[PDB]
């Protein structure tokens, strides 16, 4: 069975997610508008990403144990995982119907061609789409989804982590909660090797992270592209 501590952890992570992910996408109006006539989708998508960093941080703060870490380690962890959690949380809007991210209206519906209109290439976009499909196929329960995001954030192997023993202990408590949840609450056949398939997604995210960071570096070396970013995006991703 799920212990009462494990039930608590799930309860908090569900709530923390409901409080940082608005499924009506109402705030999207406040973004610089999408242009599909260059890098015409860069202003819109930088604002979307910037907004999403803030939400990921809000989610992170509420992870049981996260607040016992130093502010230094909190920083390393959020800085390296932000892109990954944005990719994960975006699965909620992703749809296999047309391989797009559907945020409630045609204006806020993003496809392969919109992402390339933000200065990215297929070297990132094709594996990102593949990631989104494989993840959607897992048909995760909300409980598994929020647990996966939290485990991704609290990873002990990120470069620059000082107290790695403590980061691993916080994560172990989440990993164990996830494994037990799958065994007690996820009925076969869906549950088939479900944990190991979720952990593999965390591997895939490392590759996507490395490729995004490479193209981000190339995109942002140009001061005219950098001008189109936000201060938070520049602080978190670089330069």
């Amino acid at each position: 069975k799920l212990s009462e501590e494990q039930q608590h952890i799930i309860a908090i992570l569900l709530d923390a997610h409901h409080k940082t992910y608005d499924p009506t996408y109402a705030d999207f109006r406040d973004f610089r508008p999408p242009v599909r006539m260059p890098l015409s989708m860069l202003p819109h998508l930088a604002d979307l990403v910037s907004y999403s960093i803030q939400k990921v941080i809000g989610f992170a703060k509420m992870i049981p144990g996260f607040r016992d870490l130093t502010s230094d380690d909190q920083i390393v962890l959020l800085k390296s995982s932000a892109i990954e959690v944005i990719m994960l949380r975006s699965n909620q809007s992703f749809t296999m119907d047309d391989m797009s991210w559907d945020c409630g209206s045609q204006d806020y519906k993003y496809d392969v061609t919109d992402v390339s209109k933000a200065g990215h290439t297929l070297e990132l976009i094709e594996p990102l789409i593949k990631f989104q499909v494989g993840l959607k196929k897992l048909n995760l329960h909300e409980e598994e989804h929020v647990l996966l995001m939290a485990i991704c954030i609290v990873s002990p192997d990120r470069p620059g982590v000082q107290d790695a023993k403590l980061v691993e202990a916080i994560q172990d408590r989440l990993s164990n909660t996830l494994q037990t949840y799958i065994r007690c609450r996820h009925p076969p056949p869906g549950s088939h090797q479900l944990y190991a398939k979720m952990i593999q997604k965390l591997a895939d995210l490392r590759s996507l992270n490395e490729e995004h960071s490479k193209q981000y570096r190339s995109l942002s070396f140009q001061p005219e592209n950098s001008m189109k970013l936000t201060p938070l995006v520049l602080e978190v991703f670089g330069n």
Binding site: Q54, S71, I75
Partner: peptide, 11 residues
């Protein structure tokens, strides 16, 4: 180093 915005958002 120096992440003043990230540090503000964290608390």
């Amino acid at each position: 180093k120096n992440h003043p915005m990230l540090m503000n958002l964290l608390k």
